[PDB]
Amino acid sequence: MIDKSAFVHPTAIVEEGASIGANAHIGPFCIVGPHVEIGEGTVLKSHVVVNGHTKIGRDNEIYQFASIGEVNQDLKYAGEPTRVEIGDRNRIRESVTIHRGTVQGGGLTKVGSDNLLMINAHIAHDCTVGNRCILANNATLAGHVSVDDFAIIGGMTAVHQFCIIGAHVMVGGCSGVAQDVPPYVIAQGNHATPFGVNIEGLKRRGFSREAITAIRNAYKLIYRSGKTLDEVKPEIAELAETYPEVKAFTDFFARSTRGLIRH
Amino acid sequence: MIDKSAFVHPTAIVEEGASIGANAHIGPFCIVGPHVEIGEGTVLKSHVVVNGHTKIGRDNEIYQFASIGEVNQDLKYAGEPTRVEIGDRNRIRESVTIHRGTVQGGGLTKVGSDNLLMINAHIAHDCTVGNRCILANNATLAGHVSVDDFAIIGGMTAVHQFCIIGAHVMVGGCSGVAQDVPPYVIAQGNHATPFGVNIEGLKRRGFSREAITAIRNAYKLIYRSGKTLDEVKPEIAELAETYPEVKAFTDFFARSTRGLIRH
Amino acid sequence: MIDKSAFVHPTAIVEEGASIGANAHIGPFCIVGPHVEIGEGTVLKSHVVVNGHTKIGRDNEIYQFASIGEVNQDLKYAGEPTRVEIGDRNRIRESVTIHRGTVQGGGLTKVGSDNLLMINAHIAHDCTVGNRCILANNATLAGHVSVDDFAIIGGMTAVHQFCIIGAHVMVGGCSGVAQDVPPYVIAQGNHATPFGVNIEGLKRRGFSREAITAIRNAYKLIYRSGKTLDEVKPEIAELAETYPEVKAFTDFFARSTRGLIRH
Ligand SMILES: CCCCCCCCCCC[C@@H](O)CC(=O)O[C@H]1[C@H](O)[C@@H](CO)O[C@H](OP(=O)(O)OP(=O)(O)OC[C@H]2O[C@@H](n3ccc(=O)[nH]c3=O)[C@H](O)[C@@H]2O)[C@@H]1NC(C)=O
Ligand SMILES: CCCCCCCCCCC[C@@H](O)CC(=O)O[C@H]1[C@H](O)[C@@H](CO)O[C@H](OP(=O)(O)OP(=O)(O)OC[C@H]2O[C@@H](n3ccc(=O)[nH]c3=O)[C@H](O)[C@@H]2O)[C@@H]1NC(C)=O
Ligand SMILES: CCCCCCCCCCC[C@@H](O)CC(=O)O[C@H]1[C@H](O)[C@@H](CO)O[C@H](OP(=O)(O)OP(=O)(O)OC[C@H]2O[C@@H](n3ccc(=O)[nH]c3=O)[C@H](O)[C@@H]2O)[C@@H]1NC(C)=O
Ligand SMILES: Cc1ccnc(-c2cc(C(=O)N3CCOC[C@H]3Cc3ccccc3)n[nH]2)c1
Ligand SMILES: Cc1ccnc(-c2cc(C(=O)N3CCOC[C@H]3Cc3ccccc3)n[nH]2)c1
Numbered sequence: 001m002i003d004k005s006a007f008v009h010p011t012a013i014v015e016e017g018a019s020i021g022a023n024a025h026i027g028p029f030c031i032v033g034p035h036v037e038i039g040e041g042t043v044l045k046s047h048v049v050v051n052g053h054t055k056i057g058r059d060n061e062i063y064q065f066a067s068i069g070e071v072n073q074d075l076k077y078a079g080e081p082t083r084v085e086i087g088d089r090n091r092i093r094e095s096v097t098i099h100r101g102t103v104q105g106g107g108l109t110k111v112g113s114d115n116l117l118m119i120n121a122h123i124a125h126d127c128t129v130g131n132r133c134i135l136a137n138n139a140t141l142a143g144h145v146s147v148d149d150f151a152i153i154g155g156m157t158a159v160h161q162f163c164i165i166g167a168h169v170m171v172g173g174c175s176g177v178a179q180d181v182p183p184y185v186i187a188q189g190n191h192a193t194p195f196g197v198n199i200e201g202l203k204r205r206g207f208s209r210e211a212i213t214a215i216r217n218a219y220k221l222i223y224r225s226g227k228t229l230d231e232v233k234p235e236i237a238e239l240a241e242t243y244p245e246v247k248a249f250t251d252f253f254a255r256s257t258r259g260l261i262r263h
Numbered sequence: 264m265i266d267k268s269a270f271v272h273p274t275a276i277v278e279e280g281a282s283i284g285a286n287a288h289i290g291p292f293c294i295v296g297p298h299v300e301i302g303e304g305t306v307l308k309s310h311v312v313v314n315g316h317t318k319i320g321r322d323n324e325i326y327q328f329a330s331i332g333e334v335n336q337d338l339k340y341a342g343e344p345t346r347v348e349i350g351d352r353n354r355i356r357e358s359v360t361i362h363r364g365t366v367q368g369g370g371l372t373k374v375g376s377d378n379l380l381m382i383n384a385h386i387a388h389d390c391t392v393g394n395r396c397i398l399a400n401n402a403t404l405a406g407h408v409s410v411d412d413f414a415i416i417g418g419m420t421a422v423h424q425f426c427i428i429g430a431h432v433m434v435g436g437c438s439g440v441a442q443d444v445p446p447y448v449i450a451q452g453n454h455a456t457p458f459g460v461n462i463e464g465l466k467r468r469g470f471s472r473e474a475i476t477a478i479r480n481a482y483k484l485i486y487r488s489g490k491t492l493d494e495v496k497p498e499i500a501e502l503a504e505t506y507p508e509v510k511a512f513t514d515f516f517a518r519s520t521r522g523l524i525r526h
Numbered sequence: 527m528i529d530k531s532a533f534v535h536p537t538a539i540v541e542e543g544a545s546i547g548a549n550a551h552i553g554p555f556c557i558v559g560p561h562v563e564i565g566e567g568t569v570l571k572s573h574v575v576v577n578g579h580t581k582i583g584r585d586n587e588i589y590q591f592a593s594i595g596e597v598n599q600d601l602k603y604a605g606e607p608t609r610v611e612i613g614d615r616n617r618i619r620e621s622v623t624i625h626r627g628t629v630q631g632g633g634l635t636k637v638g639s640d641n642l643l644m645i646n647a648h649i650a651h652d653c654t655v656g657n658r659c660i661l662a663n664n665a666t667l668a669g670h671v672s673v674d675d676f677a678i679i680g681g682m683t684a685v686h687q688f689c690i691i692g693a694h695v696m697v698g699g700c701s702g703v704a705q706d707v708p709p710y711v712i713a714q715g716n717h718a719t720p721f722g723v724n725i726e727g728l729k730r731r732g733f734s735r736e737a738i739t740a741i742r743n744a745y746k747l748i749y750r751s752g753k754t755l756d757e758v759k760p761e762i763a764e765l766a767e768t769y770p771e772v773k774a775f776t777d778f779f780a781r782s783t784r785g786l787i788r789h
């Protein structure tokens with residue numbers, strides 16, 4: 001149903017069955033399929049395509065020429081009714097593409113809240129983007145990629161399938177990420193390698209001096225101690241007993257499937 | 264003429280003279296010029312611009328915000344009535360651009376069949392794309408580039424004008440190709456350099472063990488023997504007398520104008 | 527007001543207050559906001575969004591899926607009524623984005639005349655593009671970037687915020703520019719470094735043999751003499767006393783805020 005307080009431009013095509021929330025705005029020449037849900041206050045500026053089984057939260061801003069919910073580019077996909085979930089207060093800029101999941105990959109592409117997806121960012125099938133992330137222009141995720149909370153990916157950068165971009169990471173522009181990036185790390189290059197802790201980001205986000213020091217010491221265990229990852233894992237868990245922020249490493253290690261980026 | 268079994272959305276603008284085949288589908292807000300031919304079963308999803316002297320085959324899927332047949336970006340082009348040809352069963356994704364040829368370059372941009380052109384791939388004037396190719400997101404061909412059968416070009420990769428991407432090549436993502444890539448080769452980097460034979464691709468495509476061995480031996484002649492290309496050409500032709508797959512090298516050498524990528 | 531000789535397609539939406547000049551053409555499914563001025567003879571092909579306080583000159587060609595005047599991507603921007611200015615005879619290709627300024631950055635994004643902005647080029651808030659420039663496909667300017675007269679930026683290349691791309695520069699494709707590029711220089715790489723003087727460009731643009739020699743000698747002072755920039759500045763000014771073309775260096779040095787690209 002279309003809420004009586006939603007605006008649907010006369011040139012937009014909203015198919016029967018679409019759910020449009022209160023005070024939403026569907027601009028001219030938008031197309032909205034019958035399995036789409038658009039939350040309260042969300043705006044589709046103009047020339048937006050939203051289709052598939054796709055749920056969009058509240059107060060989103062989706063700019064012209066974006067394609068949300070579309071058939072993914074995985075040759076394995078065969079038209080199965082997979083899904084997209086998008087949270088609240090995202091800014092989804094011109095030409096962004098967010099594609100539906102695959103059965104093989106779990107059936108769901110998910111984006112959280114308060115993200116900024118810049119022009120022509122690409123969220124492939126089965127990706128999971130967290131909250132407060134930034135993808136700069138042309139940032140490109142292959143299928144099954146995770147971008148964890150607060151992570152930032154610079155312009156022109158691409159991420160290989162299944163990689164994890166950890167929480168509070170900063171990936172430089174013009175980079176190619178082929179392995180997993182631990183939380184709190186700065187990464188850059190082709191292929192991307194680690195350049196220490198994202199100290200300034202943690203500072204601005206309220207991390208204490210003690211937490212940042214512990215995170216720097218965990219970084220040193222991984223990349224400067226010379227031990228194997230299997231040796232350092234319990235040392236990082238031990239450190240997390242005192243500084244809970246360090247637990248992000250433990251949680252990341254359990255999800256990592258491609259190994260860590262390294263010098 | 265518009266076939267009686269084609270669907271033309273009421274908001275689409277199909278100019279008189281366009282030819283639309285049986286069971287084709289022209290979605291909302293598409294524009295189709297008077298010299299366009301769209302084959303049987305081809306679908307333009309929505310918001311597609313097709314113009315120029317442009318022939319499109321059957322069972323193609325062309326997604327929103329694509330521009331097919333448009334004026335090319337060569338400053339030498341002056342509006343002459345050049346052409347685009349596109350074959351059958353292509354998947355041409357959001358924002359792909361395929362531009363018309365130039366008189367200077369032969370007048371024709373051509374794409375074969377069963378290709379996958381991912382989001383914002385660019386096929387410049389006078390390019391020739393074969394069959395069963397893949398161009399990943401943002402893959403960008405300058406003018407006059409050839410992409411031969413089964414070749415794959417990774418995300419964010421660009422190819423300098425006139426280069427040949429040989430048959431069954433795999434070019435990595437985040438790469439810049441400045442010279443010609445022999446058939447069967449893996450290439451990666453900025454600028455791209457060769458990394459051996461695309462063994463896994465040949466395996467999956469039915470090449471025999473003997474053919475792959477001969478191709479590996481031809482690769483060694485080119486890049487490991489230390490001889491000049493002029494010395495190895497007759498040695499490769501000799502090898503092709505027994506293994507016909509090796510003839511692809513000979514045919515490629517005759518077309519190559521920029522020299523081969525090298526370490 | 528809409529000039530009586532302008533064409534406005536029946537499907538276009540031109541908001542009351544927009545100014546459309548003589549013999550302009552607003553194609554199907556374009557949107558033009560109430561504070562837009564479109565000059566005499568300018569063409570919006572189709573599916574173009576123009577909004578904000580945006581002035582566009584005469585004889586421009588703006589292709590489908592372009593977004594001109596749109597809200598910028600700077601998180602600091604809060605909706606203030608900033609501006610875009612675009613000159614004459616520009617070719618602005620599919621999916622180009624040109625964004626409005628920020629109060630913090632001066633309030634104005636400006637593009638001159640006779641530029642070629644290829645597919646998906648991005649002109650961020652507060653950028654200044656001069657005359658006769660070329661941005662190739664996917665060339666991406668962060669905020670506050672200057673691209674001076676005749677400069678060319680190759681495909682897939684991105685420029686870090688506040689950088690200056692000097693007059694008659696040629697930046698290669700697949701490059702990342704993190705510092706300022708002096709006039710007349712060839713730059714390439716990630717990050718971009720200098721590769722001598724753009725001799726061929728100067729030749730084609732009518733520079734005398736004496737002027738090019740002096741420019742080459744100024745280049746040598748900067749990058750080959752081994753002196754500091756502070757030592758060479760007066761030596762370059764001295765050279766400019768005889769060869770006025772060398773003054774471009776002096777003017778550039780006074781604007782440069784990020785240091786020069788270097789080997
Ligand atoms: C420096 C880092 C640069 C990163 C650049 C990233 C750019 C990403 C652009 C967005 C793409 C995204 O929307 C879709 C996506 O990632 O899909 C794939 C899907 O996430 C994956 C897992 O589920 O599976 C697929 O990728 P794979 O590479 O695993 O597929 P495949 O094994 O079927 O191989 C695809 C083609 O490559 C050929 N091949 C494969 C291996 C080889 O060694 N040589 C070779 O030629 C093979 O013949 C086949 O034609 C999927 N692809 C295809 C084309 O189906
Ligand atoms: C690591 C690899 C990265 C590759 C990145 C590729 C990105 C491709 C994006 C798609 C572009 C495609 O759609 C169109 C295309 O490739 O067109 C050109 C056409 O294929 C070509 C041949 O026919 O001719 C043209 O390229 P050239 O470089 O050969 O043209 P030109 O000789 O006229 O030079 C163009 C400008 O460069 C200036 N120049 C040239 C040489 C030099 O040394 N310095 C210089 O400034 C010169 O003044 C002029 O303003 C054409 N261009 C132009 C702008 O007209
Ligand atoms: C090899 C070169 C590659 C270059 C690639 C260029 C790609 C450009 C794509 C076009 C973007 C353009 O349209 C907009 C633009 O450039 O805006 C910014 C604006 O020009 C700038 C100045 O006025 O200010 C902003 O950039 P900054 O990086 O200066 O912003 P910030 O200081 O607010 O930091 C942004 C985020 O980065 C986080 N951060 C910052 C520093 C750090 O060390 N770690 C970190 O995580 C920080 O927490 C915050 O969430 C603006 N950004 C944002 C996101 O607001
Ligand atoms: C020397 C250097 C090396 C590598 N990358 C860069 C680089 C990336 C960007 C970029 O994409 N953006 C987005 C627009 O907001 C401005 C900026 C924020 C950002 C900075 C760093 C990483 C990720 C995002 N700008 N410069 C610079
Ligand atoms: C370590 C490494 C180095 C260089 N490039 C990559 C790279 C490229 C891609 C990519 O574009 N795609 C398209 C989407 O299908 C998945 C994948 C298929 C492909 C793989 C390799 C080359 C070309 C295509 N993914 N990773 C990885």
Ligand SMILES: Cc1ccnc(-c2cc(C(=O)N3CCOC[C@H]3Cc3ccccc3)n[nH]2)c1
Nearest residue numbers: 423424441662678679680681696697698699714
């Ligand atoms: C070996 C090499 C190294 C780095 N970059 C390249 C490179 C860039 C381009 C490119 O973007 N274009 C735009 C389309 O017009 C053709 C060409 C003009 C141009 C040339 C050089 C710099 C900037 C523009 N082509 N090759 C080549």
